[PDB]
Each structure stands twice: as C-alpha cells, then as structure tokens.
From a paper:
Internal thioester bonds are formed between the side chains of Cys and Gln residues, most likely self-generated by a favorable environment during protein folding. Here we experimentally demonstrate that thioester domains are prevalent in Gram-positive surface proteins, and that they share a conserved three-dimensional structure despite being divergent in protein sequence.
The only fully conserved residues, the thioester-forming Cys and Gln, are found in a [YFL]CΦζ motif (where Φ is any hydrophobic and ζ any hydrophilic residue) and a weak ΦQζΦΦ motif, respectively. Both motifs are consistently predicted to reside in a β-sheet secondary structure context.
Residue numbers in the entry: 102 to 276
Amino acid sequence: KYKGYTLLDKYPKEDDFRDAIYIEDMDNNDTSSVVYAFNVTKATPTFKGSVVKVLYNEQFGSSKLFTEKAIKPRVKGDELKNSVLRVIYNGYPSNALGIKEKYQLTEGQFRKLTQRAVWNFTDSNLSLDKLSQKEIDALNELINAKNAIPDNLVLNLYLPDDSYYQNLLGTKFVT
C-alpha cells in the first residue's frame, strides 16, 4: 500500500507548479518517489500535510492495462506506452536529452513540463497555459522527441482505492 500526495510548497511561486506528486510506502516514510498523474478530470492526491491520506495500489504497466485505465488517450497500445516512457526518459529527472539545460529551466518548470507532456498522450490534453516561450519550446521538444529508449525501461501504474482520485505512473529499469 502506497500513499500518494502533492507537495504544494516544493517549488517557488514562479514555477507555477504546486501539484508536484510523490508516492510513499505507508510502512516507510524514509523514502518517496516522483510520479506523474493521468486522468486529469479526476482529483489530485491530497497535500502531504492532509488529514486525508490517499491510498494507491501498484500494478505493472502493460500496454493493455495502461490503455484500459486512460480515459481519453491520444494513441493506444504500445504507442501510448512507449510515448510516455520516452517522455519520462527525456523529462524530470532522467533528462536524457539535456532539455533542462538547453532551455535553462528550473527543476520545477522541467517537472511541470514533463507532466504536461504526459497529459498530451494520456489525456489528449496539451496545455500551454501560463507557459513562457522557452517552456513552450521545451515542451514541444519533449513531446516530439523520437530518440531510442532503453529496451528494459518499464512503466509502473498506481491505482487509487477511490476512483475519485487521479491515477499515477512512474518508470523503472528491469535489471
């Protein structure tokens, strides 16, 4: 069992990115992991200080399951899975293409853009709202990249006990 939460004060006001999301094992707050949401019409996980702890179950992110769970994906199957894997490989914090440094982004801005790039595929939603031109440039690079991804990178899905809340995803390497 995991809890998922937003860390509303993680980034400064100028990054316009409060909904930085993490998951944590309920049996251990020694470690937390960065994750990204999908199904944006649902509610974000509650803030870390909330008296409401939003619980999640992890599941292997197969193409079939991912597509089934996405409410309005832009593409389906392997293409949806691989498109998202690549965004994460190229986004915060993997940064495989050096996009962060190229556009002189802060950590918060880069993570925000990675989230927006995920939504482009999972939710058919490319939001440019409140972005600077360099952020728009970075986001467009991120969503249009076609670099090869490592062959052993896989998707983890996190499904909330309560369907009111957003689904979450992360990646890992099979070693």
